[PDB]
């Protein structure tokens, strides 16, 4: 059929072939043929997505009526819905197509269905020259996606220094918060982007708690980026108690996520030294409400002497890490029950099924008590059909 014929010709950029298929067709008829969806996409969306500049120019000369029509595009095996041509061209990095669509009057802030702008798509994949062209053509820096994530946030998350720098030079609001309270400083802390964090602080970005109660410092401790933790624990905006807790939580991350007991001890000793540095104002460990069977009824070490006999006792270290995480992150942070379950799984693998079951029981009780990453979802995600070699 002629519908799919012109579609496939647009998708492949075959200009002479396409003009042959429209020869001696009424203006009103070709405009109906170009405005036709095929596999959820228009001929213009395909020509723009694949960077066929002469095809994009030809189609728009015929009829500009689909220039804002969003449809289905594929990026690296993922399908994105309601994407207009400008967005797809920006996401794919086709600068000349970007310039051409804007010339024909494409709307610079027309988003996908998740409210991702063309500027967001360019920031995501790091297309600096497109980011600049969009901003020079009135793209709104502060239109965020449906989670409230901004262009500055995703640039920081992806470690795109030059783009982050340019957005800042053009006046991006450094203190925007996503729906869950994420700021661009958290994105730097979660990605370990220290140079970008320093750039944000040149604009006096404020360190704030996100929806999980996490500062950028704590986010770095949770994810294990020691470069961010080292920087921020020498930053005057973090108090002594915040520094001690961040170092102790980072140690727990070394135990459970990095499986690095020597590295954990280094940070626990650093924090313990700080707890006792002022002999007149000792920061002692807080005492929890009750001892916990799943933690083997352990309690946190409270002096430098109790730390010295710890490396030969890996089981004590694993219980310390659990005590520390529950103290600092709290029961309603998803990492707390996650790492309890992970520790239980390790005991199951070593044949300690009673320890395993008590840890899993505690994690489930914790999860159910704070309700307002299941075993089945973890299992299916793990063995999900990563069909390696099927293509080649």
From residue 320, alpha-carbon distances to 23, 102, 214, 249, 356 in Å are 77, 58, 21, 10, 17
Residue 376 domain flag: no
The helix/strand/coil state of 155 is: helix
132 and 146 fall within a common domain: no
3-state secondary structure at position 71: strand
Same domain, 15 and 97: yes
Same domain, 107 and 164: no
- Asked if 105 and 169 sit in the same domain, the reply is no
The range of the structural domain enclosing residue 193 comes to 141-238
Q: In whole angstroms, give the CA distance from residue 21 to residue 34.
A: 12
How many C-beta atoms surround the C-beta of residue 364 within 10 A? 13
CA distance 256 to 317: 10
Assigned domain for 296 exists: no
> Comparing C-alpha atoms, which of 230, 216, 214, 228 is closest to residue 266?
230
Between the alpha carbon of residue 252 and those of residues 44, 148, 352, the distances in Å are 53, 31, 22
Residue 48 exposure: Cα atoms within 13 Å on the Cβ side: 33
Same domain, 126 and 35: yes
100 and 116 Cβ atoms separated by less than 8 Å: no
Give me the half-sphere count of Cα atoms (radius 13 Å) on the Cβ side of residue 292. 25
Question: What span, in angstroms and rounded, lies between the C-alpha atoms of 35 and 38?
Answer: 10
**Token match 């009135």: residue?**
138
152 with 79, same domain: the answer is no
* CA 287 vs CA 282, 290, 291, 327, 330: distances in Å: 15, 8, 10, 9, 14
148: left (phi over 0), alpha (psi -120 to 50) or beta: left
Nearest to 189 by CA among 214, 165, 164, 161: 214
Q: Could you tell me if residue 3 is inside a domain? A: yes
Our separate counts of H helices and E strands in the chain read 22, 2
Q: Obtained via which technique? A: X-ray
Same domain, 127 and 146: no
From 238, 272, 288, give the residue that closes a domain: 238
| DSSP states along 335-381 | HHHHHHHHHHHHHHHTT-HHHHHHHHHHHHHHHHHS----HHHHHHH
Q: How many CB atoms lie within 10 A of CB 288?
A: 13
98 with 158, same domain: the answer is no
Resolution in A: 2.1
- Count structural domains, the chain: 2
**Which of 236, 264, 385 lies closest to 321, judged by CA?**
264
Q: Where are the alpha helices (DSSP H) in 192-260?
A: 194-202, 216-223, 226-232, 240-256
Residues 5, 96: one domain?
A: yes
Residues 50, 100, single domain; the answer is yes
Q: Supply 212's token pair.
A: 């999980």
Domain boundary among 120, 137, 154: 137
User: At residue 305, what are phi and psi to the nearest 5 degrees?
Assistant: -70, -45
Question: Do 6 and 118 belong to one domain?
Answer: yes
User: DSSP letter at 183?
Assistant: -
Does some domain include residue 270? no
Distance CA 151, CA 140 (A): 10
Main-chain phi, psi angles of 156, to 5 degrees = -65, -40
Residue 161 is assigned to a structural domain of this protein: yes
12 lies in a domain? yes
Q: How far apart are the first and last CA of the chain?
A: 33
Answer yes or no: do 162 and 122 share one domain. Answer: no
Any residues with CB less than 8 A from the CB of 236 and at least 6 apart, and which?
none
Q: Dihedral sign, CA of 289, 292, 298, 301? A: negative
SS3 72: strand
Q: Residue 366: name the closest of 320, 317, 326 by CA.
A: 326
* 71 phi and psi angles, rounded to 5 deg: -155, -165
């Amino acid at each position: 059929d002629l519908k799919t014929a012109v579609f496939n010709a647009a998708r492949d950029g075959k200009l002479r072939l396409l003009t042959k298929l429209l020869a001696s067709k009424s203006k009103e008829e070709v405009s109906s043929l170009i405005s036709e969806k095929t596999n959820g996409a228009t001929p213009l969306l395909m020509a723009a997505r694949y960077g066929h500049l002469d095809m994009v120019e030809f189609l728009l000369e015929q009829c500009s009526a689909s220039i804002e029509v969003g449809g289905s595009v594929n990026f690296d095996g993922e399908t994105i819905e309601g994407a207009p041509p400008l967005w797809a061209a920006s996401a794919a990095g086709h600068l000349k197509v970007v310039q051409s669509l804007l010339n024909h009057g494409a709307s610079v802030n027309n988003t996908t269905l998740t409210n991702s702008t063309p500027l967001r798509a360019a920031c995501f994949d790091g297309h600096l020259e497109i980011v600049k062209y969009l901003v020079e053509h009135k793209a709104d820096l502060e239109v965020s996606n449906r989670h409230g994530h901004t262009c500055l946030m995703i640039s920081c998350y992806k470690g795109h220094k030059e783009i982050a720098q340019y957005l800042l030079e053009k006046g991006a609001d450094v203190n925007r918060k996503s729906v869950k309270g994420n700021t661009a400083l958290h994105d730097c802390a979660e990605s370990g982007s220290l140079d970008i964090m320093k750039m944000l602080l040149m604009y006096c970005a404020k360190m704030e708690k996100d929806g999980y109660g996490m500062t950028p410092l704590l986010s770095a401790s949770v994810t294990g980026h020691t470069n961010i933790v080292d920087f921020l624990t020498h930053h005057a905006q973090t108090s002594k108690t915040e520094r001690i807790n961040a170092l102790e939580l980072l140690g727990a991350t070394f135990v459970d996520k990095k499986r690095d007991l020597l590295g954990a001890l280094k940070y626990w000793k650093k924090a313990m030294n700080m707890r006792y540095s002022d002999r007149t104002n000792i920061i002692s460990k807080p005492v929890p409400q009750t001892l916990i069977m799943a933690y083997d009824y352990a309690k946190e070490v409270n002096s430098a002497e109790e730390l010295e006999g710890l490396i030969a006792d890996p089981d004590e270290m694993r219980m310390q890490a659990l005590l520390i995480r529950e103290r600092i992150l709290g029961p309603s942070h998803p990492d707390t029950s996650y790492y309890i379950r992970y520790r239980g799984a390790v005991y199951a693998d070593s044949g300690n099924f009673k320890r395993c079951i008590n840890l899993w029981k505690y994690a489930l009780d914790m999860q159910q008590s704070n309700l307002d990453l299941s075993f089945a979802e973890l299992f299916s995600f793990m063995l999900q059909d990563r069909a390696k070699g099927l293509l080649g």
